[PDB]
Amino acid sequence: NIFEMLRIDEGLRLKIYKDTEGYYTIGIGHLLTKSPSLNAAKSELDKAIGRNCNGVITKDEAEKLFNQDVDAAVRGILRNAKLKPVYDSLDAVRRCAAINMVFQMGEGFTNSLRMLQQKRWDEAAVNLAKSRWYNQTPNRAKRVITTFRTGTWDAYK
Numbered sequence: 001n002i003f004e005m006l007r008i009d010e011g012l013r014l015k016i017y018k019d020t021e022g023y024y025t026i027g028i029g030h031l032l033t034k035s036p037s038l039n040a041a042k043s044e045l046d047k048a049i050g051r052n053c054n055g056v057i058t059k060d061e062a063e064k065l066f067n068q069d070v071d072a073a074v075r076g077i078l079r080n081a082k083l084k085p086v087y088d089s090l091d092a093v094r095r096c097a098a099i100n101m102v103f104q105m106g107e108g109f110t111n112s113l114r115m116l117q118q119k120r121w122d123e124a125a126v127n128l129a130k131s132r133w134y135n136q137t138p139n140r141a142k143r144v145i146t147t148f149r150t151g152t153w154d155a156y157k
């Protein structure tokens with residue numbers, strides 16, 4: 001399911017860390033800020049958790065943020081007039097791949113979206129790889145793309 005999939009892709013770290021773009025993050029890939037200021041990240045963390053964390057959270061707190069973040073990704077899809085029709089056209093496994101992408105990059109994939117809605121899976125997979133996303137995080141992008149190409153969990157198993 002989407003939680004297991006993103007837990008694999010994001011890991012779990014209980015202290016503030018930097019993501020692949022160098023941005024302060026915590027938990028299961030929860031972005032805190034794009035600001036280079038660790039103090040700004042710590043303020044965002046305390047606001048998100050509701051207590052003075054000093055840059056460290058518990059596993060329960062990380063999992064709660066993760067639930068909120070997955071929910072937010074789903075809502076960003078459902079509220080977006082470009083994403084919702086494609087998402088609704090997908091089966092349950094491919095819907096997880098869609099949520100995964102939105103979780104990672106947030107709300108340029110117009111042509112890939114069309115190919116996915118048309119169920120041209122190999123063509124969509126080729127188009128999805130022609131991206132900064134694929135070049136910068138190729139192993140994760142390959143897993144997500146394989147999920148779109150096959151409609152199976154094979155890349156995660």
Ligand SMILES: C=C(C)Cc1ccccc1
Nearest residue numbers: 083086087098109112113
């Ligand atoms: C961005 C993509 C090509 C994947 C996707 C599809 C549907 C909804 C959200 C994301």
